[PDB]
């Protein structure tokens, strides 16, 4: 499944590891086609090595909306479900 990871202000360690498995099409944007197992290992790496940072991971799925995403870090938006549709929720500014 196509996988995209977008990082903001994460340690060099995380950046270096994403670049081991994914193509860095812009600094802090990583794209690849990986299996679900690989994807989950990549999420582990994100939760472990991102600290002050914001991360979002999105991947293609066979669902009504056709993709799924999960976020990490401060001010992360939250993935929500509306009658089977994937949407996003966030805090008032």
């Amino acid at each position: 499944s196509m996988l995209v990871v977008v990082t903001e202000n994460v340690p060099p360690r995380l950046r270096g590891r994403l670049a081991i498995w994914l193509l860095e099409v812009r600094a802090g944007v990583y794209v690849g086609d990986v299996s679900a197992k690989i994807r989950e290992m990549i999420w582990e790496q994100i939760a472990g090595l991102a600290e002050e940072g914001n991360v979002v991971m999105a991947w293609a799925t066979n669902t009504e909306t056709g993709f799924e995403f999960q976020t990490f870090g401060l001010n992360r938006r939250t993935p929500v479900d509306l009658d089977g549709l994937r949407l996003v929720s966030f805090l008032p500014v």
């Binding site: 509306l82 089977g84 549709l85 929720s89």
Partner: protein
């Protein structure tokens, strides 16, 4: 750079909003929870947004919805249409007057109605029938098909009301009626100007939707009615969204409207 509505086929057919307020904040179409949480809805990528009682809509929202060509539908019990808002009228006069001449001239009217018959029933109408006469034939066939479906799903049938089954049918066709109004407006025609149904608020909607109504949507109303689940409405709506996607309903709606109108053999407006 101009903002152009994407085709209805390239959108999610419909979204029902149960609670909250609809608004635009920092340039994003947004549903606001009573707690204050913001949920982003990509408005341009949905064909129909339904508003159940207990929803508030802002000026900026109606404005944006209209500009991206997303119909807003206020709904009530069984999802019945209460109201709708969008761009006021069709921008092209040639399209309206074209539809209007077809509907006013009784010979042209019949030519159109015959095509509707042919499309709905897979065979030509009996020759030399008036529009009124054809509606009788159509009526009998429908009641027949209503009955036949009841036998195939084990649902008790006492007729159609216009009753778990009767609630399901209305919900199912209300969903079809919604995206059909959406399709009629997107094509630039008047929902109010019809051929079979007349003087009624959305005559042309009923005209178009009733043609494809029984293919999948109404049979689905029975499959769910046989089940007799606690909340029939939410289940039917989800099913219609499924049907519309797999049947490619929205993509099939545009040429259906033009063909029905083209049957009058009056020259159509240019693309």
């Amino acid at each position: 750079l101009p903002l152009n509505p994407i085709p209805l086929k390239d959108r999610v057919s419909m979204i029902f909003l149960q609670y909250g307020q609809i608004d635009v904040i920092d340039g994003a179409f947004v549903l606001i929870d009573k707690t204050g949480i913001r949920t982003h809805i990509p408005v341009g990528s949905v064909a129909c947004i339904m508003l159940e009682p207990g929803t508030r809509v802002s000026h900026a929202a109606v404005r944006l919805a209209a500009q991206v060509g997303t119909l807003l539908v206020w709904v009530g019990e069984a999802g019945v249409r209460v109201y709708a808002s969008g761009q006021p009228g069709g921008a092209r006069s040639d399209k309206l007057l074209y539809q209007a001449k077809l509907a006013l001239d009784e010979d042209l009217r019949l030519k159109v109605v015959r095509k509707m018959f042919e499309l709905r029933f897979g065979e030509p109408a009996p020759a030399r029938r008036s529009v009124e006469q054809l509606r009788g034939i159509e009526g009998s066939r429908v009641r027949a098909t209503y009955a036949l479906l009841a036998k195939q799903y084990g649902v008790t049938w006492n007729g159609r009301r216009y009753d778990t089954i009767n609630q399901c049918i209305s919900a199912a066709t209300s969903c079809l009626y919604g995206v059909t109004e959406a399709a009629i407006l997107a094509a630039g025609y008047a929902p109010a100007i019809g051929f079979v149904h007349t003087g009624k608020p959305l005559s042309f909607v009923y005209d178009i939707a009733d043609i494809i109504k029984f293919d999948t949507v109404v049979p689905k109303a029975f499959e769910i009615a046989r089940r007799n689940p606690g909340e029939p409405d939410r289940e039917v709506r989800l099913a219609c969204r499924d049907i519309f996607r797999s049947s490619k309903t929205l993509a099939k709606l545009i040429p259906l409207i033009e063909d029905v109108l083209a049957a009058g053999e009056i020259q159509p407006p240019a693309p």
